[PDB]
Amino acid sequence: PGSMNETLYGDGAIRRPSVYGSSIENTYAGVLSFMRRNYTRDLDGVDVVVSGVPLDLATTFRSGARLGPSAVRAASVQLAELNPYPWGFDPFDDLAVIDYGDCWFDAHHPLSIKPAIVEHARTILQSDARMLTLGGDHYITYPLLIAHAQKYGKPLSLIHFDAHCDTWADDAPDSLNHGTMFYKAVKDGLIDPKASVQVGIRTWNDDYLGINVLDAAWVHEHGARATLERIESIVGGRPAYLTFDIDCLDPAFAPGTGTPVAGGLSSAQALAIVRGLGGVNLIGADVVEVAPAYDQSEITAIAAAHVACDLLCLWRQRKAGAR
Amino acid sequence: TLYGDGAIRRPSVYGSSIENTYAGVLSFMRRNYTRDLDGVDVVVSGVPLDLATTFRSGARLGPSAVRAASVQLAELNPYPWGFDPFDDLAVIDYGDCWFDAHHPLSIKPAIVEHARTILQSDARMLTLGGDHYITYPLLIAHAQKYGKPLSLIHFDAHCDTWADDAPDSLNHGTMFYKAVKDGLIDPKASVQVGIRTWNDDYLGINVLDAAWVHEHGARATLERIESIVGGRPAYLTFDIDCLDPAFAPGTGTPVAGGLSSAQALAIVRGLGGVNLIGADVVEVAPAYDQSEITAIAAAHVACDLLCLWRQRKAGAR
Amino acid sequence: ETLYGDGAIRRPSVYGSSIENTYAGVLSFMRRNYTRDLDGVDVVVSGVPLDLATTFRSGARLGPSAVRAASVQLAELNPYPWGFDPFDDLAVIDYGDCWFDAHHPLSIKPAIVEHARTILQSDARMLTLGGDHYITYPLLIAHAQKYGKPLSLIHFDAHCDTWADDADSLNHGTMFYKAVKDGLIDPKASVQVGIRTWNDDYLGINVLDAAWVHEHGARATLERIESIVGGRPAYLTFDIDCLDPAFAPGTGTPVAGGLSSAQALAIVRGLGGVNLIGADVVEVAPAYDQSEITAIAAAHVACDLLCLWRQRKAGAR
Amino acid sequence: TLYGDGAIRRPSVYGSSIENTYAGVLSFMRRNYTRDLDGVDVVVSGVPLDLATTFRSGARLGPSAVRAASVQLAELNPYPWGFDPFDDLAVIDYGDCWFDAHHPLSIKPAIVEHARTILQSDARMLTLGGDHYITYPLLIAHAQKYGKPLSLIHFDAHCDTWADDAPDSLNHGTMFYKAVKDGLIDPKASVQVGIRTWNDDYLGINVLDAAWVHEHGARATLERIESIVGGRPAYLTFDIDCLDPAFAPGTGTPVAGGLSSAQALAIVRGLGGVNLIGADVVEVAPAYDQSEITAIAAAHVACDLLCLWRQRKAG
Amino acid sequence: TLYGDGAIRRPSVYGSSIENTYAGVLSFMRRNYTRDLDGVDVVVSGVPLDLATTFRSGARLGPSAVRAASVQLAELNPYPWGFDPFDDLAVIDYGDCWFDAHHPLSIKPAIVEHARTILQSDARMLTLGGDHYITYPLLIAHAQKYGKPLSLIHFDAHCDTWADDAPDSLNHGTMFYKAVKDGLIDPKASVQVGIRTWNDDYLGINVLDAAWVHEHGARATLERIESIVGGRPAYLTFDIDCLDPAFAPGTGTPVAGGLSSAQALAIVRGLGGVNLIGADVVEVAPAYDQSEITAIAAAHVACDLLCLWRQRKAG
Amino acid sequence: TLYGDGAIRRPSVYGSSIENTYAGVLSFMRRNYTRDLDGVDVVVSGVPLDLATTFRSGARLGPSAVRAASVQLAELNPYPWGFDPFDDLAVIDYGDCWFDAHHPLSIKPAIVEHARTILQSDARMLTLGGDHYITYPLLIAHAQKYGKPLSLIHFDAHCDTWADDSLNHGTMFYKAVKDGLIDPKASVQVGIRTWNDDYLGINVLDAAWVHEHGARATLERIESIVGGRPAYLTFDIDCLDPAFAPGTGTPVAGGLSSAQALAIVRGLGGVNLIGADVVEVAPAYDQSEITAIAAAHVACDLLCLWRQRKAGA
Ligand SMILES: [Mn+2]
Ligand SMILES: [Mn+2]
Ligand SMILES: [Mn+2]
Ligand SMILES: [Mn+2]
Ligand SMILES: [Mn+2]
Ligand SMILES: [Mn+2]
Ligand SMILES: [Mn+2]
Ligand SMILES: [Mn+2]
Ligand SMILES: [Mn+2]
Ligand SMILES: [Mn+2]
Ligand SMILES: [Mn+2]
Ligand SMILES: [Mn+2]
C-alpha cells in the first residue's frame, strides 16, 4: 500500500489515491462501488457524485426498491472493464466521479425522510459536483428537486422517463407516495410543465398538468431520434434534471421493478435516446425503482447501470468540450 | 366509495373501490365475485386445464396467475382509453369451471356446459386458461348461441390445426383442426397472427406469421384482420406464446422470434369495430413465469378486451 | 348439497367444506367464506399487509395473499393428526384485509387498533396474517381492551423485538419493548421461543433460545411454555423467521440455526390447554419464498391454531 | 477405461467410465442407454406422467430431472457402501415409457405393458416418476410376475388410499385404495412411512407417521419395516414428498413437517434384509425444484436402491 | 416409425421419430447418439468450457442446456423451412469433447484434436459451447482442413480481439486477436454483428454494431454480410450475448441494447448463399437462464444452421 | 457514532457504526475496507476462484455473496456471545486476492504470496472462497509461519484426499498430507458423506455420526484430537445439507443443519486456531441468500472465537 510504482490490481474503489483513472479488476470480484469509483465523502475536485437513496416506503405496489442502489452497483462491474460504447473514451481520465455511499435516514420516523434527502443533496451541491442518484423509489426525486432548485433556481425542466406520470393529484403534501410527488413538484413551482417532458408513458391521468407527454406508443411509432429531437426542442437550454424510472422499459427488459406495465421501451431505444442528449443543460439526474428481489439475472440492474454510465459520459463530454 | 376488498363488499356490479395494490381480494380486476348473472355484460371465468399440453404442464394455474397480475390495471383507468370501464360495463368474476380431472373424458362436456350456462344470460365470456384445448368446447357453446361458422381471430406461435381424426382426443395442438372439421369456424374469414411453426396444411386459414407482423407493423396487421373478418361474429383467442419468450417466459411451448407486448396490445386495442362475441387468454403457466411478466401481459390483453366491450356497450362502436 | 368449486363465495352457511380443485377456486384462507358479517362467527382470519416497519428486506406486505394461496392443500383433507374437519363445528370466515393509508404511516397504528376493535366486538377470535411483526403491537392494544392486561405472550421468533426505543416510531424490532412498558404483557408469564439474537435487556421475559429447543426437544419446549403461561389469557404470535431459513427462506430477517417446521408444529399442536385469546402469523415475504415453502409452513401454523380453537369450542379441551 | 460419454460408448453393461461431472450423456448414473435386456440385473426407466396429480403439475419432467441430478453419484463409489455397484450389478437406462397423453385411458395399459416387457427379462425395475399413479399399473405387472398379495413399503406424506370406486380414474391419491381392493398388496404386511395427512380409513395398512419417525429414529423405523414385511416379496415406492419441503421443494403436494434426507436415506440404506422385488421414486417436479435439491435427494434414494440390489445379488 | 427415445433406437442416421416433448433421450434435436462418423453430414458436439470466462462462470453447462432446449424444435418441421432436415441431412450428436480441466494447458490441444478427428470424416461441425475461447482451437482445426485465411461471421456483443501477447493464455475475450495474428481469419473478409463494446483496435474487421442493425434491419445486415464474405470458406460463430439480455439472460457477460431473437434468426435464416464450412453457438450459461429462454434461442440458431446445410446439400 | 457507510468512514479499526441493514458499503460485517495491517488482529479477504471445481462453477462470486449476507450479523451483538467483537478485536476487510485467471498456473503462487503478505503482520486470516482448492496454498503459507505439521479441522461432505501441478478442489488435502503440511492423526473431518478408498488416517466424524451423537459429542472429539496444536479450520459450506446450503457446486444429500454446525464451531474456544476459511459458496445456485447467510454466520463465530482468545491471552 503506497509503495513506489504500486500496481493496483483489484479493489481500486478503496486503493486509488486520486479521483481520476481506472484500475484493473477481476470483473467477478473487487469492491463493488458504482463503476468501481472511489468510495469517499471528500468532495474537493469532484465533478460527479454517485450516491444511493435506499427508500421504498413510498411505493404503491411491490416493495423492494430499497435494495436498488446495491443492485445497480453490483450490475455496473462490466461497464468498468472497457471504455463505454460507442463513446470510446475512459471517462474517468478527465471526469472526477466518486461513490459517496448512501443517504442515511431513520425509516422508523418517516416524516424525517424528506428533510434527510434534501440535506444530503444540499451537502453535495455545496461542492459544485453534479449528482447522479440511484434509487430507491421515485419519491426521492421530489426532495432532490427541492435541493436542486435551491442551487440552480426554479422552475427547472424535467426530463422524465417512466411508464407513470407521477402527477396524480394528492391533497396531502406530507404524504410519502412515489406516484404523486411530481404533482407536488408542479404545485411548488419546482418544474416548468411547458418545458418538461415525460417519455414512455403508458398509464392514465385525467390531468397531466400541461407536461409534454411522448407515450410508449409514440416512441415506438416515431423512433429514438425523433424522440430525442422532441426532448431537445422542449427543454432548449434550460437547466434540466433527468429522472429515469427503470419501469419506462418493458417488463421483458426490466422485470425487477415494483409497478411493471406491459408495452414499454427496449433498453436499445432508451439508451439511444439518453446517449443523444449532449446538447441538454443537464444539472443532475437519477435512476430509480430498481427492485432486485424481482430482478432476473440482474438484467434490470444492468440496464439501470448502462443509463447511469451514459449520463456520466454526457457529463464527460460537456466538461471536455468546455476545456 | 369502499376502502378495501371491493370484490366481496360492493352491493352494485358497477364501479371501482379503493384498494391497496398489494392486498385485497384477488378477483380479476377486483370485479365482484358472484354466480348471479342477471344484468351482467361480461363474465370473467377460469378454466384451469393443462391435461391437453404437449410440452410443459403448468397452465392449470393460469387463471389465478392472471387474476393476481391484474391488480395494477384496477388502480387506474386503462390506457389509452381513459375511462373506468366498470362505470358503464357490468363485469363479474364467476370464479372457475369445476371439472373432474381424474375422469378426463368428462372435461369437454363440463366446459361446454359452463359456457352454455353463462351464455343463457346473454353476458359475454372472457375466459382465462388453462391450455388452448379449452377454446374448442368454448367455441362449441358459442356456435350454439351465435351461429356457425364463426370467424376466429387467433394469436399464437402455433396454428393448432395439426391433423387429428380421433374425436375424443385431448390435445391443445389439434382442437382447431377439429373446430374446422365440425364447421365451427370459417377458415377464409379467420386469421392466425404471430405463427412461427410449420403445418403442411393450414386448412385455408389466413396466416400472418411473426415475420410478417415484424415487417409490416401493428397497424397493417390490425387492418388485415379487420378486412378478413369484416362484420362477422368473431371469437378472439389469445395464446400468450404469441409473444416472444422474452415477454412471455411463463408458457408451456415457448418459440423464439415472437411479438412484443407493445405490438400485440397495439393490435388488440384497435379491434373495437369487430363483432367480438367472446374471447379467451390462454397458456399462462406461472411456474415458468418470471416476476409475473407473462401473467401481466395476459391481464393487459384481457383488460383491453373489456375496454372494447365497454365502448360497444356505451354505443361508441 | 355439497358444492363443487368456489365455496368461499357460494356457501350460504359459514359452516362446512366444499369440493375444490386444489389448483383453482377462490383463494380465501382455507377456502373459508369471504364476508364482513361477523354474526355467529367463532374465528375471523384477516390480513394486515404491512412492511413499513421492517429493518432489512421489505416484502411482508404481500404475506397475507401468500399464506392464503399456500393454504389450498390444507382445505382438501381433514387436518392431521386431528382427523376432523374443523369447519363442521367451528365458524371461521375470511374478512379480507385491514385497509390503511400507507402514505400516511402515522395513521397505521390506529387503523389496526380499529380493525381489531371492530372484530373483537363480535366476540370472534382473531387469527391475523401479517405483514411485518409491528402489527402485533396494535393487535395487543385491542386485545388487552377486551381480555384485560397484562396478557401472557407466547412469541415464536429469532428476535425478541424488545430492544429499547424511546420514541411514535414504526419499528418491527421494538414494539414488544413498547408493549411491556405499556403494561400490555406480563414478562414473567410470557415466553419467547427460538430466539437467536442478542439483547442486553430481555425485560424479564422467559427465553427458550433455538439451541435450547434443539437440545431439549419440542415436547420439553411445549411443557415449559405451558408451565410459564398456566391458565392465564394468552396471545400467540408466530414470526415465521422462528424457523430456520432452510424451512422459511421467504422472510425479511433470516437468521441461521432455527427450528424445523416439524419442531414448531409439534409445539403448536400441543398447546390445546392454553387459554389462547387470539393469534397471528407474521413476516412471510413471498418475493423471497421458494416454491411457497415458507407460506406453506405459515398456513400449517394457522391451520393448527384453528384446530386448537375447534377442540375448545367442542369441549374436548 | 473410456473418457466421456460412457452411456453411449461402453461395449459392456458393467463398469464405470471417466466423466466430467458437468458434461457427458445424461443417463441415470451414466448407465448404458439400451433396450437390450439380456443379462441385465436392474432396468432404470422413466414414466413421465403428471395427468393424475391433484395440485401442481410438473412431475412429467421428473425422470429427466433425476437423471441430471445423478451426475455426482456416478463420480464416486456410493457412501457408505464403498463399492462401485456397476462392477457386479448390470444396470441399464432403458429411456422412458412412451404413451399418448392425448388418449389418457391408454396410459395405464401402456405402463402395464412397459413393465410386463421388462419383467420378461427377469431384471428388476427401478422406475423414475412421474406422479404416484404410475405405481398402480407397475404393481399390476409386478403382481403378475411375483404373485399376490405383495408387501408395499411406501414412503410418502400421503397414504394414497382415499376411496375411489371408479377403476379407470387417473388419480395419484386413490391408486393404493385400488391396489388393496384388487388384492395386489397385503395391508397387514405393508407399511407407510412419513405419513402426515388424514384418511378416515387407512385400510389396515401399518402407518409410521412423520411424528413417529422423528420421535423413534431411523433405526427403530427400519426395524419396524423389517418386522412388518418379513421375507415377503416387497415393492418399495418412494414419493419424494415424504421429505419435508425444505429438502424436497420440487414436488406437487408439499406438506410441512416431513423427513430429512438424512433420515430417509438412513432408513433406505438399512433395508438389505428385505426381499426387494422392484422399486420406484416418484413426484419430482423440476419446475418447483430449487438448485436441483429435490432431484438430488431422489437420485440418492435410487442409488441406494441399486446398492441394496448389488448386496442381494452378492448374497 | 419408432415411439420414444429415437436418439438411442433408430438404426439409420436419417429421419425423425415420435417423442413426447417432455421425455425421451435428450440429444441435440433427438439426433442419434454415436461416435461413428461414416456417411455423416453434420456432427453436433459440445465443448463444456468456462475456464476462459472473465465475468460469470456457468457456460460449462451450456451444451446440456441447449440439448434440453431443443426438444420442441424436433417435434415439427422447422419454420419457415417447412421440411424435416433429417430426411436428407445426416446429423448426429457426438456427445462432448472430454478434457482434463485440472490441467488447463491441455485444453487447447484437446479441442484441436476433437475437431481434427471429426473433420477427417468430411462432416461439418456444429459445436455447442462453452465459453467463446473454444472457437480459437476450432478455427485452428478448420484452417488445417479448409485452408487459411477463413472468413469469420461473428455474432457477439464483444469483438474478442482485445490485445493479448501471452500465447498460452486462456481468455474468451482475446482469442480472435490470436486468430488474426495467427493468420487464421481474414479481417477484411470477416464481419462482427451486434457489437456494443469498445476496442481501440478492431484489427480492420468489419463491424456492424447493435445500433447499426437496429437502424438498418435484418435484410440490410444479411446483405452486408454476404457482400463481405462472398464465396470464401466461412465459419459462423454465434455468441448468445449478441442478443439483448431480455432475450438471453443466461450468459456470463450481458450487455444492454442487443438484438432480438427475431432479428438474429431473420439474419441467420438468410445466409444460404454463404460457403458455410462450420459453426458454433457459445456462451449459454444455464444457471443464469430464465425458463430456458436463452438455451431456446441458442437451439433455434443451431436448428437454422442445420437447415442452411440441408439446403446447401440439396444445391 | 457515525450513521451509514462505517466501512469507509470510521477513522478507527475498532467499533461499530449505525447502518440501515438494506444499504451502506458491503464489506464483511461492515468492517473497515483497508490494506493497512498495522495493529490488526484478523484480516478478512476473498479469493474468488472456481477454476478448480469438478461440477458446477460459481464459487468465484462467493466472497461478494458472503459479504452481502453478513449485513444482519453487523446490526446486533452476535448470539449467544453477547458482546460486540469489534470493540476489542481489530478486524478489517482487505478486499480480494487478485490473480490472472487466464494464466492459471500463476494462481497457486499468487494465493501463497497473498497469505505470506498478510501473515507478515501477525494478523490471523479469515478467508472467504472461492472453491476449496484455495485452502492448499493458504495452508502452505500458514505452515511457513506456524511450522509443519499443522492440525486441520475440516468441515465438508468431501474428504478432498483422493489420490492425485493440478488445479483440483478434491485432491489438495492428499497433497497436504503427502507434502507433510498437516498431521492426519491430529486432524479431523466433520460431515463427510462421500467415499474414498484411503482416508489417509485422518479422523472422520461422518454426517451420520454427527446426527447420531450430536454437536457436543462432536466438538469434544474435535478438541480431543487437536489438543493444543496450531490448527487451521476450513469450512466447506457443502458440509451442510443442500436444504440449508443449496448454493454450492457439489451438493450431497444427508448433511448437517446450520444449527448443528454453528453449535460445533461456537464451542471451539479451546482450540489453538491459527487461521480459517469458509469456502464453496456459489451464489448463482443460492436461494434467498440462505447459503451465504449460513457462511457469514460461520465466519462471524470464528471472529468471536478469536475475540475470546485475545481476551484469554
Ligand atoms: Mn415513477
Ligand atoms: Mn413508474
Ligand atoms: Mn395454441
Ligand atoms: Mn401456442
Ligand atoms: Mn419479530
Ligand atoms: Mn423475527
Ligand atoms: Mn403419493
Ligand atoms: Mn405424496
Ligand atoms: Mn464472445
Ligand atoms: Mn460476448
Ligand atoms: Mn471440499
Ligand atoms: Mn465439499
Automatic annotation (TrEMBL), chain B:
Specify whether Metal-binding is a keyword of the entry.
Answer: yes
Its top-level enzyme class, in one word, is hydrolase
Free-text comment on the cofactor = Binds 2 manganese ions per subunit.
Q: What are the recorded Gene Ontology BP terms?
A: putrescine biosynthetic process from arginine, via agmatine
Record-linked InterPro entries: Agmatinase-rel, Ureohydrolase, Ureohydrolase_dom_sf, Ureohydrolase_Mn_BS
Instruction: Cite the GO molecular-function annotations of the record.
Output: agmatinase activity; metal ion binding
Xref: Gene3D superfamilies:
Ureohydrolase domain
Q: Where does Mn(2+) 1 bind?
A: H132, D156, H158, D160, D239, D241
CDD domains under this entry? Answer: Agmatinase_PAH (cd11592)
Record EC number: 3.5.3.11
Family matches, as Pfam families? Arginase (PF00491)
Keywords linked to the UniProt accession: Hydrolase, Manganese, Metal-binding
Q: Which residues bind Mn(2+) 2?
A: D156, H158, D239, D241
The protein's required cofactors:
Mn(2+)
The record's similarity note reads:
Belongs to the arginase family. Agmatinase subfamily.
Q: What is this protein called?
A: Agmatinase, putative
From TrEMBL, chains D, E:
Residues bound to Mn(2+) 2: D156, H158, D239, D241
Keywords assigned by UniProt, alphabetized? Hydrolase, Manganese, Metal-binding
Q: Which GO terms describe its biological process?
A: putrescine biosynthetic process from arginine, via agmatine
Positions binding Mn(2+) 1 in this chain are: H132, D156, H158, D160, D239, D241
Supply the SUPFAM superfamilies for this chain.
Arginase/deacetylase
GO MF entries: agmatinase activity; metal ion binding
What remark does the entry make about the cofactor? Answer: Binds 2 manganese ions per subunit.
The Swiss-Prot or TrEMBL record lists the needed cofactor(s) as:
Mn(2+)
In Pfam terms, one family for this protein is Arginase
- InterPro entries under this entry? Agmatinase-rel, Ureohydrolase, Ureohydrolase_dom_sf, Ureohydrolase_Mn_BS
Q: What is its EC number?
A: 3.5.3.11
Q: Which domain of life is it from?
A: Bacteria
Family label: Belongs to the arginase family. Agmatinase subfamily.
* Protein name in the entry: Agmatinase, putative
Q: What species does this protein belong to?
A: Burkholderia thailandensis (strain ATCC 700388 / DSM 13276 / CCUG 48851 / CIP 106301 / E264)
UniProtKB/TrEMBL annotation, chain F:
Residues at which Mn(2+) 2 binds: D156, H158, D236, D238
Keyword S-adenosyl-L-methionine (UniProt):
no
State if Hydrolase is listed as a keyword. yes
State the needed cofactors, names only.
Mn(2+)
Give the GO biological process terms.
putrescine biosynthetic process from arginine, via agmatine
UniProtKB keywords: Hydrolase, Manganese, Metal-binding
Give, as one word, the top-level EC class: hydrolase
Q: Which GO terms describe its molecular function?
A: agmatinase activity; metal ion binding
Q: Coiled-coil regions in this chain?
A: none
Pfam families (UniProt xref): Arginase
Record-linked InterPro entries: Agmatinase-rel, Ureohydrolase, Ureohydrolase_dom_sf, Ureohydrolase_Mn_BS
Q: Where does Mn(2+) 1 bind?
A: H132, D156, H158, D160, D236, D238
The protein's Enzyme Commission number: 3.5.3.11
Q: How is the cofactor bound?
A: Binds 2 manganese ions per subunit.
Q: Which family does it belong to?
A: Belongs to the arginase family. Agmatinase subfamily.
Q: What is this protein called?
A: Agmatinase, putative
